[PDB]
Design a protein around this ligand. Sequence first.
Ligand SMILES: [Mg+2]
Ligand SMILES: [Zn+2]
Ligand SMILES: [Zn+2]
Ligand SMILES: [Zn+2]
Lengths: 243, 166, 97, 85, 107, 87, 171, 505, 10, 10
Amino acid sequence: RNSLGNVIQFIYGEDGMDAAHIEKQSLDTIGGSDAAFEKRYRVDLLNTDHTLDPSLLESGSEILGDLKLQVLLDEEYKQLVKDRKFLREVFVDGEANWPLPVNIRRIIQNAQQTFHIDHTKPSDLTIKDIVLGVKDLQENLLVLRGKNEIIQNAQRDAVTLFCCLLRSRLATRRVLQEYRLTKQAFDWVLSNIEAQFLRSVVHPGEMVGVLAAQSIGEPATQMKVTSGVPRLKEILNVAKNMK
Amino acid sequence: RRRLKKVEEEENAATLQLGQEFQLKQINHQGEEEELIALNLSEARLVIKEALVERRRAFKRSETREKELESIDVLLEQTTGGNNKDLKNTMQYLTNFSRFRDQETVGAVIQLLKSTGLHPFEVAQLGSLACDTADEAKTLIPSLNNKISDDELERILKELSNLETL
Amino acid sequence: LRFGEMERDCMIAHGAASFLKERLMEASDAFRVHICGICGLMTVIAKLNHNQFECKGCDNKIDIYQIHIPYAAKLLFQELMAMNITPRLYTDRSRDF
Amino acid sequence: LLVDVMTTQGGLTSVTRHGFNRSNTGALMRCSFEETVEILFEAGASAELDDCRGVSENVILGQMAPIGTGAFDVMIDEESLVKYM
Amino acid sequence: IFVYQNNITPSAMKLVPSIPPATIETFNEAALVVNITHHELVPKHIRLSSDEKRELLKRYRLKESQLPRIQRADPVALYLGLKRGEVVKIIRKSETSGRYASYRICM
Amino acid sequence: LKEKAIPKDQRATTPYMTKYERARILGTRALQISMNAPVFVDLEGETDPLRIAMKELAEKKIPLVIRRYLPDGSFEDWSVEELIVDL
Amino acid sequence: MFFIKDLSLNITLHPSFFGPRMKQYLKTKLLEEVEGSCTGKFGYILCVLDYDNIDIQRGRILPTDGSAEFNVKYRAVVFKPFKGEVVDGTVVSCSQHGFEVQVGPMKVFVTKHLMPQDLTFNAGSNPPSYQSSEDVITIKSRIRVKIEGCISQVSSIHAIGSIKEDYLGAI
Amino acid sequence: VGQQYSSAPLRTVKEVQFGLFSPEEVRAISVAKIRFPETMDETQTRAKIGGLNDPRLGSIDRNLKCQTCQEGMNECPGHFGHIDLAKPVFHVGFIAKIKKVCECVCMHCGKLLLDEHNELMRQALAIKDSKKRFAAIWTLCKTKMVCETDVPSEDDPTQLVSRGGCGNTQPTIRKDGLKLVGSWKKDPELRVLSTEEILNIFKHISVKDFTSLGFNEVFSRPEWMILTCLPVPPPPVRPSISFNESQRGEDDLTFKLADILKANISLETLEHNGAPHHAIEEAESLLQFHVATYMDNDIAGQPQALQKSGRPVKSIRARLKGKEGRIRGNLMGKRVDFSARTVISGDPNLELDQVGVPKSIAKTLTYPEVVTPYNIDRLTQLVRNGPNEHPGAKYVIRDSGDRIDLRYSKRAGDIQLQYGWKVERHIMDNDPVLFNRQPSLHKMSMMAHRVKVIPYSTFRLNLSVTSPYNADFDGDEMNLHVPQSEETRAELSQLCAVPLQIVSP
Amino acid sequence: TXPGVTXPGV
Amino acid sequence: TXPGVTXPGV
DNA sequence: ATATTGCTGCTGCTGCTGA
RNA sequence: CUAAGAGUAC
DNA sequence: TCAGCAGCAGCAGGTACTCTTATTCAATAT
Ligand SMILES: [Mg+2]
Ligand SMILES: [Zn+2]
Ligand SMILES: [Zn+2]
Ligand SMILES: [Zn+2]
């Protein structure tokens, strides 16, 4: 808001994130082919077309043929397909590298280097544990603390793209096969993701107007169709007639 | 508003112009509004006594006119220190010209005046001045003109005279 | 040294309010002035030696406040008054936000 | 944020004395940009009231602007202070 | 809604505002060849009911004037038939978050 | 002020102390220590008021409260005790 | 007349005084400041009511100063004279120009213009007093007076009253 | 000593209420009436009573106190006077507004031309912004040239309702210089509208009428746009900065006020003695010109009122406007103390957040440290060392306000420090200091460093930190600001520190 | 405009 | 108009 | 003999018969 | 004091 | 129910910082 109290943006940067806490990351669901997508995420316990190696996890020889777990996998993969469709609608060019607050890849590498993942012992995790932990972490990423329908909807809309990133990285197949997290390593990863997200939220009292003005002016000092300072002057001074 | 300079009507009790800060309704410290409770002399004296004895107790945890004067002077010197010549004079005045004695009679007077249902300033004036007759009361307090019936006014002043005990 | 406009803007961007206030007041020019309560003008005769405060024109002696403003601000207000403009300073809100 | 400020009034508001500076945002902070004396005269004639919420108003008055560290009030709690000892 | 070929004579433009609550809106066919709301630059506009506006102002502690403004001549405002005081919710595809919802009050 | 004060049971602000709040709390406490205010923590030989206030904040012995002002004029009172200093 | 009223006072405390007894210090400093005071806004202020628990509120630190400003609210008993009101009092002094009557903490001056014609001043009567053909008003005499004038000073409210009216005088 | 104790309550300004001075308020606040243009009496050694330097307005000499408040030049704000004008004159900043208002209001009966009966006046008056409502009222009522004593009924345009109109023809009003000329359409009659009749017709505007035009009933009525009493600023506003070491040199405002007084006296004498209307009008025009050029000397078209020395007169408006005027040159940005500036050199042996400070600069700049039981010994030692050697103290600020200068204080002997005193001492190592390079285009050009005292004449900084500053070592100069309190020091270290700015937003 | 950037006009 | 803001007209 | 005075940027209205 | 000129780092 | 035209006039100008040089006449009257 400005001095009069008029709303400029209903949430800062349309995400409520401090700019210094943003890093470029890749959305893995938006890219790739359909066959590559299914090979990456689709897991089917009932059939052998997309079954998982029982050596991946301790219960892999016992969960085979389960029904409730298959329901969880079905809803997870349906959510992932929905996320792919949403991201392809959002980004027409298909660009996957975008700035987002929390760097998941470094957290996964830290967990791998900290707990000494041997990559041979069958994983202690259970599929239900992974799915429910990700679902709860989605709910623990709070930007708005209000307790009414308007604020709840705004909060849900403010973290949708980071939630898409989180589902893209912390998928069941990816956790069990590519990264081979253990139980404790997965819990540690969840805790750090939550803490870093809560640490990347913008601080009230920030003078974002002066920051934006300086962050636009300084590159201009560092500086067919007109461009550069004359074009910036033509834009800021809304001129009826331009070159 | 925030008028530069200020014009207001002059204070006049006979006209019932108490003042801008002595209006009928006052906002209490709890956020709601209350009637401006106008204490008569006896009720005000009892309130002063209650406040002083409560202050004495709180500091502790952390009748003939001669002996009442001695009690008020001793408790006053025990409770408060300097800049109390005003308070000393007020307290000796209160014990000198006192109309009622204790809690019972002042409660009876206040409930009677509530039954009269008159202005708090006017009921305080009625309780303060020990009048005798009707027209005498009406001329002592100009605000009494045609507010309560003659029979009711006469009887209530009769119970003021009766409850004027000791 | 001149503490220019854009230096003040950088310090605003940092969020350092108290440092900016100290730069503009305690380091350059801090001046205490007495103002009336009925009117916002600085037309208050304040005899500090005798502990007397009187605003001629409002006929008051009990509703006076003191403020700390830059001397340049006092000069600006006096120049506005000399140019037939009244910059009344009030220390309470007459309107809700 | 820049393009949101420029279009928040329903039209394209330029960054010029004929654009943003013409809003009803406070006489003291409007005069600090350009056309100082004319703004003061118009505020005097129209009897504008300045709420002193802007940065420029408190800068002129030499008082802590309600920005950054000034965006809140620090207060002493008697009960907590007794509670510590 | 009235649709005309070229123009309306001012002698009829003056009587276009009829007895309330009947409102006459005039459109040109040339302006209606292309549906502007299908442009990708144009985000989604949803008119709010009175109760929704009241809830919006209550939850955000806003006054009427503290909302962003949309003119009562904006092409989408004419398209949706906004009257003054009515608030449109604007759903946008943000690039920092997937979805962003703004609000604009008609003026 | 009764209307302005949001009741404690329905505060809707972040439970984390902001950088500006922490900076002002440290500055205020160091200024008070420099002016001979009583210290609520045991000193291990430190003499700098700023680091004394930092030690007080580390173990939450600062008896101050932040009055966070909402844009409409309402406020919420958050004690330094209950604010989580994650930064 | 006597009332009790809601009042508020701003007290500033230095940083060195924020010990565990801060509430006690504030409660004591409300006294000795407004107890037994005299203002034109509220007349006299004799005592504070409800001293058991005085509402002290939080206390805001003045920035760059460190001192804290408390807005303490309380009940105070007050005595405000009013023009056009009748009150009892005790005659304490007399003179050619009039006589002074003690009422509570204040003195009310009744001028010679506001006594009946036969109630002339006389220095022959001891003490020099305002005497009529039926009664004499000397020192230490009860009297009812109707107040008609008030001028306010910081240290002493001054009042002018009258005893000409019917049934006004010695009871 | 600064300013001594005052019993008045201390508050902060919450709201600024603008408006216009009423003549009676000007006469009420004034402490003196100014009637003589001479600043000094015939002896040329005192301030003339009733002149422009009346002692009641404030003292012009340090050795003498103000005659009104009995305070020195340090304390006295200055008190206004007033000049009672012989005839009303226009305010130069309100001539256009006066023209619009008199064009919106009947020039005979003082009522707005189009009442609520007109169709478009409901729309115009329903505008809540005061400035937009006036624009609409003007652009709809400028074209009407009759008071319309009878108007069609609002219910239906069949029967006629008679309002309080006077039925007179309004003129077409233009401005010819500083005067408004009205050409009445022939019932043309061209004549100059006297400010007397304009003032009279403004004073007859009803409260409802001018409150719909944007004016306020209390703070700015339209008739206050006409000047009848000039407020005279005190000598603090217009000081006599005599630099000839003997000859007083007066401010431009003093000369303009003397000219206004001369013209006022001339007009008064001409009116009293009786004269042809031509001379009276000429004197009135001269008075109007002098007042207008006093408030604003940059009037378009008219020639500038040249000063004595032949240069243009600096008016109040010129004093206020500009990059070097009050607002932009003394309030938004001002010169400050406790600052240093010098050439910068690189140092690979300094940490990223360190800055090397020349020893002499460290000896000049000081920090005031409050004496505390925790730092009594080292502060005492610094006081013993004195100001001529580093580290040491330059001043001792006592609680009474007296300031012991450590130079010339060794004669008095050792000083015993008391808790609560201040030692104003040289900046030592590890002091947070703000550090700036003047073409400051973003926040990272004003980061905070830690002091490291070095034995040479250049500021020394790490090579890596030169990129955010955009600073080379080909002769660049940089500035240093020292915080003077614990709060500013703390927030400067906790918000603006160099490491906290490594990643930029 | 201004000057700079008179008025307009004047 | 004026000029500025001839006449009208001329 | 000494002091006073004579390149860049805009803004707005008036008026019908004829054919 | 004002005015003017030569500059230094951007 | 619609086709054709005109008039005018106004200056300053990015942020800090250093240094030097010169500064309005003549005549009348007390
Ligand atoms: Mg360089
Ligand atoms: Zn006043
Ligand atoms: Zn003075
Ligand atoms: Zn008329």
